[PDB]
Amino acid sequence: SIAWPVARTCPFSPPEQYAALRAEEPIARAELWDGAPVWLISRQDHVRALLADPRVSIHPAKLPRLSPSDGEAEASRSLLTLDPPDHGALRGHFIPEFGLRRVRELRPSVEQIVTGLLDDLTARGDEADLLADFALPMATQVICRLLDIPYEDRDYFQERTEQATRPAAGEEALEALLELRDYLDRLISGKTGDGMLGSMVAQARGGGLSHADVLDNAVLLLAAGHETTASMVTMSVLVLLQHPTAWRELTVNPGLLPGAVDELLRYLSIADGLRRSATADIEIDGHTIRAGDGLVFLLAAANRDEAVFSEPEAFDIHRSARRHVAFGYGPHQCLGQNLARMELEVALGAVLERLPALRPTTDVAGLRLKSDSAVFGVYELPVAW
């Protein structure tokens, strides 16, 4: 009855049906472009239980698909295409680059990047596109430093990333992904030292990783690395511009910032609709999911679950702290989440200090939304300060 995907058409609020599903239909039967059956999971308790359940698979051969061409140029050793046990064996090689230890080590870089950017920006003028002139370059520079990827090629890989991450899109999306993967393959053939990509190249020379372990995850890290953080920064600024109380309170007490970052993550929920399939029959809440059925995890719905968050539709930096699923749940829970939280704290703290009188210069209804992207966001954010 319900089509999937449902377009996200409001920056600050997921689709209205999500509320009805959580209340009235928490394991909801829906249909893909070609009528294949999918289940929509909207409550936090069911999202977490199912995403952690060994009968739920991310394996690309049975994954629900959003068009006739979705599935073309699919990777084979990406973290996002591997089930246990392979998944953790591989993820184990990358975890040292993403722990608290390492993330705190990186924070001074991020602060310097952020400060240089805002120096230029304020010197040059009092207007800008916050995504193109600040969020995207911060996020790209950070991931370029971590991986050791030429920041100079940004034009190339940024436009491709953006096109490639539209899962229902036609040949433009597919050509972008093919070209994106050839870009990383060119960079890898060039090492054959520094950064995570140097380290991965080394481990593939020792017996340790395959070429596809290396390629597939370079693409994943580079794309997820910059697209998510750019969007989250942008969108987090947009939200704070609608909340002058919160803007002032965070400027005066930066100790509020770690908490506000979780509340922005929950509220915005830029990652939504994660896809899985069931490899066995699954009984949950009076329904039976059949082996082979598709599963869709409405993280944005679950992050507004009235059973978990009071006044869940309110953005509230003073709410009691509750765990959210903006980063997903189970074995594929965002590997970059410590880095992402640190980037956001740094970026937002700096914006508050350096641009205290920031204003938007276009209406909210006039922003262009990335509704068919896997990473929700806007195409630009015009501001003045």
Residue with tokens 């207007």: 127
Rounded CA separation 383/142 (Å)? 23
Residue 132's binding partner among ligand CGM, ligand HEM, none (Cβ under 5 to 8 angstroms by kind) is none
Rounded CA separation 81/332 (Å)? 10
By the rule CB under 6 A, 340 interacts with ligand CGM: no
* Residue whose CB is less far from ligand CGM, 47 or 224: 224
Selected range binding ligand HEM among 5-13, 64-72, 325-333, 349-357, rule: CB under 6 A: 325-333
Rounded CA separation 345/258 (Å)? 7
Decide if 346 contacts 288 (C-beta within 8 A): no
x/- string (CB under 6 A) for ligand HEM, residues 129-148?
Answer: --------------x-----
What is the separation of C-alpha 71 from the centre of its chain, rounded to a whole number of angstroms? 20
By the rule CB under 6 A, 90 interacts with ligand CGM: no
Residue with CB nearest ligand HEM? 336
Selected range binding ligand CGM among 31-39, 138-146, 162-170, 254-262, rule: CB under 6 A: 162-170
By the rule CB under 6 A, 375 interacts with ligand CGM: yes
Rounded CA separation 329/326 (Å)? 9
What is the separation of C-alpha 129 from the centre of its chain, rounded to a whole number of angstroms? 21
Q: Buried (b) or exposed (e) across 249-288, using 16+ Cβ within 10 A?
A: ebeeeeebbeebbbbbbbbbbbbbbbbbbbbeebebeeee
Region class of 102: left (phi > 0), else alpha (psi between -120 and 50), else beta:
alpha
334 is in an annotated binding site: yes
226 is in an annotated binding site: no
Selected range binding ligand CGM among 65-73, 85-93, 98-106, 314-322, rule: CB under 6 A: 65-73
What is each CA distance from 144 to 110, 183, 195, 290, in whole angstroms? 12, 14, 9, 43
332 is in an annotated binding site: yes
Task: With CA atoms as reference, report the closest residue to 179 among 195, 199, 155, 202.
Answer: 155
Query: Binding residue for ligand CGM (CB under 6 A) from 3, 12, 54, 72?
Result: 72
By the rule CB under 6 A, 223 interacts with ligand CGM: yes
By the rule CB under 6 A, 268 interacts with ligand CGM: no
By the rule CB under 6 A, 340 interacts with ligand HEM: yes
x/- string (CB under 6 A) for ligand HEM, residues 273-312?
Answer: -x--------------------------------------
Binding site residues, ligand CGM, CB under 6 A: 70-75, 78, 80, 164-167, 169, 173-174, 177, 180, 219-220, 223-224, 227-228, 271, 374-375
**Binding-site residue ranges:** 87, 91, 276, 332, 334
